[PDB]
Design an enzyme around this catalytic site. Structure first.
Site, PDB file in Angstrom:
ATOM      1  N   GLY A 143     -41.325 -27.001 -13.823  1.00 22.35           N
ATOM      2  CA  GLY A 143     -42.606 -27.332 -12.806  1.00 22.35           C
ATOM      3  C   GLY A 143     -43.932 -27.829 -13.592  1.00 22.35           C
ATOM      4  N   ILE A 168     -34.338 -22.424 -12.583  1.00 24.76           N
ATOM      5  CA  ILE A 168     -34.380 -23.323 -11.324  1.00 24.76           C
ATOM      6  C   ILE A 168     -35.050 -24.530 -11.511  1.00 24.76           C
ATOM      7  CG2 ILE A 168     -35.372 -23.076  -9.190  1.00 24.76           C
ATOM      8  CD1 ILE A 168     -35.190 -20.108  -9.190  1.00 24.76           C
ATOM      9  N   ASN A 204     -40.701 -29.116  -3.886  1.00 20.95           N
ATOM     10  CA  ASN A 204     -41.563 -28.107  -3.380  1.00 20.95           C
ATOM     11  C   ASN A 204     -41.300 -27.322  -2.008  1.00 20.95           C
ATOM     12  OD1 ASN A 204     -42.937 -28.012  -5.823  1.00 20.95           O
ATOM     13  ND2 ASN A 204     -44.711 -29.014  -4.986  1.00 20.95           N
ATOM     14  N   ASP A 217     -50.107 -31.153  -3.970  1.00 22.90           N
ATOM     15  CA  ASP A 217     -49.053 -31.815  -4.663  1.00 22.90           C
ATOM     16  C   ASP A 217     -47.994 -31.566  -4.014  1.00 22.90           C
ATOM     17  OD1 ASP A 217     -47.966 -32.696  -7.300  1.00 22.90           O
ATOM     18  OD2 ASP A 217     -47.359 -30.946  -7.862  1.00 22.90           O
TER      19      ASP A 217
HETATM   20  C1  LIG Z   1     -32.416 -28.823  -7.553  1.00 19.73           C
HETATM   21  N1  LIG Z   1     -32.001 -28.321  -6.300  1.00 19.73           N
HETATM   22  S1  LIG Z   1     -30.960 -27.194  -5.944  1.00 19.73           S
HETATM   23  O1  LIG Z   1     -31.012 -26.543  -4.488  1.00 19.73           O
HETATM   24  O2  LIG Z   1     -29.637 -27.678  -6.193  1.00 19.73           O
HETATM   25  C2  LIG Z   1     -31.390 -25.687  -7.129  1.00 19.73           C
HETATM   26  C3  LIG Z   1     -32.546 -24.783  -6.743  1.00 19.73           C
HETATM   27  C4  LIG Z   1     -32.019 -23.602  -6.155  1.00 19.73           C
HETATM   28  C5  LIG Z   1     -33.363 -22.795  -5.746  1.00 19.73           C
HETATM   29  C6  LIG Z   1     -34.749 -23.432  -5.636  1.00 19.73           C
HETATM   30  N2  LIG Z   1     -35.994 -22.674  -5.465  1.00 19.73           N
HETATM   31  N3  LIG Z   1     -36.875 -22.421  -6.100  1.00 19.73           N
HETATM   32  C7  LIG Z   1     -37.801 -21.658  -5.647  1.00 19.73           C
HETATM   33  C8  LIG Z   1     -37.909 -20.221  -4.888  1.00 19.73           C
HETATM   34  O3  LIG Z   1     -36.891 -19.952  -4.556  1.00 19.73           O
HETATM   35  N4  LIG Z   1     -38.940 -19.786  -4.792  1.00 19.73           N
HETATM   36  C9  LIG Z   1     -39.828 -20.529  -5.174  1.00 19.73           C
HETATM   37  C10 LIG Z   1     -41.378 -20.183  -5.564  1.00 19.73           C
HETATM   38  C11 LIG Z   1     -42.314 -21.338  -6.586  1.00 19.73           C
HETATM   39  C12 LIG Z   1     -41.406 -22.448  -7.087  1.00 19.73           C
HETATM   40  N5  LIG Z   1     -42.089 -23.563  -7.804  1.00 19.73           N
HETATM   41  C13 LIG Z   1     -41.103 -24.468  -8.106  1.00 19.73           C
HETATM   42  S2  LIG Z   1     -39.548 -24.159  -7.469  1.00 19.73           S
HETATM   43  C14 LIG Z   1     -40.054 -22.682  -6.847  1.00 19.73           C
HETATM   44  C15 LIG Z   1     -39.235 -21.637  -6.162  1.00 19.73           C
HETATM   45  C16 LIG Z   1     -34.758 -24.755  -5.979  1.00 19.73           C
HETATM   46  C17 LIG Z   1     -33.730 -25.475  -6.760  1.00 19.73           C
END
Ligand SMILES: CNS(=O)(=O)Cc1ccc(N/N=C2\C(=O)Nc3ccc4ncsc4c32)cc1
Length: 280
Positions: free
Chosen positions: A13, A10, A125, A120
């Protein structure tokens, strides 16, 4: 680590890599964060899994084995950054912006009440779902355990004991970005970041920010720039919105509006909860 099947990465970080994973047992889909172990961290993290709120990404479990630390969070399909990119051409509808800001403030007010800061906040986020909800991710990890665009002035000037006010500043920056579709202060270094803020909001002095000239990194040699009108900074935003934004971007951390008080601001009188058109 053995009980999960990593589906996709994903994204990397500040404290580790995050993977979409499937619990080989329950079959549930989660967000597995491998923290890149101090006893103090374990205790601080432990207190976070009891922090439950509809606008905070739920910390499901904490796996501490083989001297490694994995955090299991609830999973959401998209972040605000990706959503903004996808909406770049048309912009996010004002009603949706208001809804998201309203929910984020509820989430912050909750965390702030428990004396838990983020420190942050950034679009990456903030997670959204098909229901129209938005949630804060990474809450509290800073205490327990690079984009400077959303960093509050007091942090840039060397204040060591920052308050809940730093999160309000970051949220104000994100608010402006959703409205104009351009980062408000896209600095590329700490001094560039500070100067971009000064050029827009004016170089701060003892009148607007008592004690500012005594900050660790303050220099009498800073150029003196005048403040610009917000009508020029976030053009389409109405008076209620500009008023709220200005209070979120007050230089003095003590004058900056709190999340709770922001929730009662006139800007939110006609708030609703629309459903966004997401492309997964
Ligand atoms: C680049 N964006 S996108 O939407 O194309 C792909 C994508 C898909 C799902 C997520 N979700 N990410 C996260 C999620 O579902 N729960 C989390 C808990 C902590 C954390 N710390 C950093 S990210 C992150 C997540 C983030 C990016």
């Amino acid at each position: 680590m053995e009980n999960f099947q990593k589906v996709e990465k994903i994204g990397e970080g500040t404290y580790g890599v995050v993977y979409k994973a499937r619990n080989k047992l329950t079959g549930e889909v989660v967000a597995l964060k491998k923290i890149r172990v101090p006893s103090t961290a374990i205790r601080e993290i432990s207190l976070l899994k009891e922090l439950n709120h509809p606008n905070i990404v739920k910390l499901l479990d904490v796996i501490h084995t083989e001297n490694k630390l994995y955090l299991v969070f609830e999973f959401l399909h998209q972040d605000l950054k990706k959503f903004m990119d996808a909406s770049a051409l048309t912009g996010i509808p004002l009603p949706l912006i208001k809804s998201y800001l309203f929910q984020l403030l509820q989430g912050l007010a909750f965390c702030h009440s428990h004396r838990v800061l983020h420190r942050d906040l950034k679009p990456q986020n903030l997670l959204i779902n098909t229901e129209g909800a938005i949630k804060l991710a990474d809450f509290g990890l800073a205490r327990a355990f690079v984009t400077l665009w959303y960093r509050a002035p007091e942090i840039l000037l060397g204040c060591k004991y920052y308050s809940t006010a730093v999160d309000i500043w970051s949220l104000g920056c994100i608010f402006a970005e959703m409205v104009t579709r351009r980062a408000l202060f896209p600095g590329d270094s700490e001094i560039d970041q500070l100067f971009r803020i000064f050029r827009t909001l004016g170089t701060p002095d003892e009148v607007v920010w008592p004690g500012v000239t005594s900050m660790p990194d303050y220099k009498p040699s800073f150029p003196k720039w005048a403040r610009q009108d917000f009508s020029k900074v976030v053009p389409p935003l109405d008076e209620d919105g500009r008023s709220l934004l200005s209070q979120m971007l007050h230089y003095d951390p003590n004058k900056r509006i709190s999340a709770k008080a922001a929730l009662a601001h006139p800007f939110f009188q006609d708030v609703t909860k629309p459903v966004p058109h997401l492309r997964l």
